[PDB]
Homo-oligomer: A and B are copies of this chain.
Amino acid sequence: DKTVLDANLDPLKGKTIGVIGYGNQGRVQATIMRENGLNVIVGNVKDKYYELAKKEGFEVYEIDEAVRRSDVALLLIPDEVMKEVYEKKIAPVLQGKKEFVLDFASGYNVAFGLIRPPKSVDTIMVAPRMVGEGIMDLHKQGKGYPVLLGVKQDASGKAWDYAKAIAKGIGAIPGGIAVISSFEEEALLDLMSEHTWVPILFGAIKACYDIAVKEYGVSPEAALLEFYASGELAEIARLIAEEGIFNQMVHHSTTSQYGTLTRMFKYYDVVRRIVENEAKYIWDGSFAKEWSLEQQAGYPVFYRLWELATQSEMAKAEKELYKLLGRK
């Protein structure tokens, strides 16, 4: 099957590696790779992270200098400034090359064409699905974790080899797995998760609260406690990850099972339509356009929405309560 469990690590030996950023990922991955027996450097703007990285023993230069030295580069920075940073401080130094390699952790800027490097370079992607802290929390046990792999440009016939090489160079495998796919699939998924069921969940909760209060004379404290001020949700998530989404429900009551299943099979079509709409809107690029334009405008909608959300009755009540329970 497409899956991969282990591979070689030779293509990276003898070369120097360049790491852009020392935040969550950059820090973790550079730590691991150094612990794996490789010569690696760090490129970053002069700030707290720079101080931290030079504390932990990673020789540092300026960004463009790290690329001038490196034969491989890992661009571990946000997806909102990578564009300008590339355009200014990378593309030139890169034009001055023959055989180079560039890796990302996300496919947003590439799949949509905001970054079109030369055909003189092999472009790839290695994408984990952990916030970053759990990765160390696993490495100290000597485990592995799963990731996605992708390739965009091949000028060496060695692209996948370098991909698996990196995958092993960050302790993902052996111990976990590695999938192969494109940048497009990665971006599509990372965006569907954010556009489809998360906001739906939140809106459902908000509506349940509003209703239970304003049409059945219920108290905010009780509403919050039942809905989310408890850890029921977290325990459910854990049991899912461990046993399985459906098998999990066995630990509940028959009444819960019955209602859940009925209503789920009953409300499948609506959500299906919603998901179709959003997935299409993404596959085209409309969302990238929208987001870039809002950046250029000044995040007005962002501002107003944050405001409306925090000025809501549910939020105020949650504040009073979380205060009452000593929580921060």
Chain B residues with CB below 8 A from A211, complex form: 272, 275-276, 279
Q: Which residue of B lies closest to A263 (CB)?
A: B199
Are A218 and B189 touching (Cβ within 8 A)?
A: yes
Are B206 and A268 touching (Cβ within 8 A)?
A: yes
Is the C-beta of A300 less than 8 angstroms from some C-beta in chain B? yes
Chain B residues with CB below 8 A from A304, complex form: 112-113, 283-285
A253 contacts which of B79, B254, B274 (Cβ < 8 Å)?
A: B79
Chain B residues with CB below 8 A from A246, complex form: 309-310, 315
Are B244 and A298 touching (Cβ within 8 A)?
A: no
Are A218 and B185 touching (Cβ within 8 A)?
A: yes
Is the C-beta of A33 less than 8 angstroms from some C-beta in chain B? no
Stretch at the interface among A35-43, A63-71, A158-166, A286-294: A286-294
Are A212 and B225 touching (Cβ within 8 A)?
A: no
Cα distance, A210 to B279, chains bound together (Å) = 12
Are A229 and B205 touching (Cβ within 8 A)?
A: no
- Also in contact, A284 and B301, with CB within 8 A (given A204-B271, A204-B275): yes
Cα distance, A316 to B129, chains bound together (Å) = 22
A292 contacts which of B181, B241, B297, B327 (Cβ < 8 Å)?
A: B297
Chain B residues with CB below 8 A from A253, complex form: 78-79
Cα distance, A236 to B193, chains bound together (Å) = 13
Cα distance, A112 to B301, chains bound together (Å) = 8
Most buried by B among A206, A235, A251, A275: A275
Taken residue by residue from 203 to 237, chain A's Cβ proximity to chain B (1 for < 8 Å, 0 otherwise) reads as 11111101110011011011101111111111111
Are A177 and B302 touching (Cβ within 8 A)?
A: no
Q: Which residue of B lies closest to A238 (CB)?
A: B234
Cα distance, A226 to B188, chains bound together (Å) = 10
Is the C-beta of A243 less than 8 angstroms from some C-beta in chain B? yes
- Also in contact, A267 and B203, with CB within 8 A (given A3-B324, A185-B216, A191-B259): yes
Cα distance, A327 to B315, chains bound together (Å) = 38
A201 contacts which of B200, B232, B293 (Cβ < 8 Å)?
A: B200
- Also in contact, A259 and B200, with CB within 8 A (given A285-B303, A303-B112): no
Beyond A112-B300, A194-B259, A259-B287, 7 additional contacts (C-beta under 8 Å) are: A130-B231, A134-B231, A176-B325, A192-B212, A196-B204, A242-B328, A262-B301
Give me 25 A-to-B residue pairs in the complex whose CB atoms sit less than 8 angstroms apart, sorted by A's number. A79-B255, A113-B298, A131-B232, A146-B225, A179-B219, A185-B219, A188-B216, A189-B218, A199-B263, A200-B201, A200-B204, A203-B265, A203-B268, A204-B274, A206-B264, A206-B268, A207-B272, A207-B275, A243-B327, A261-B302, A283-B308, A285-B305, A293-B293, A293-B296, A296-B297
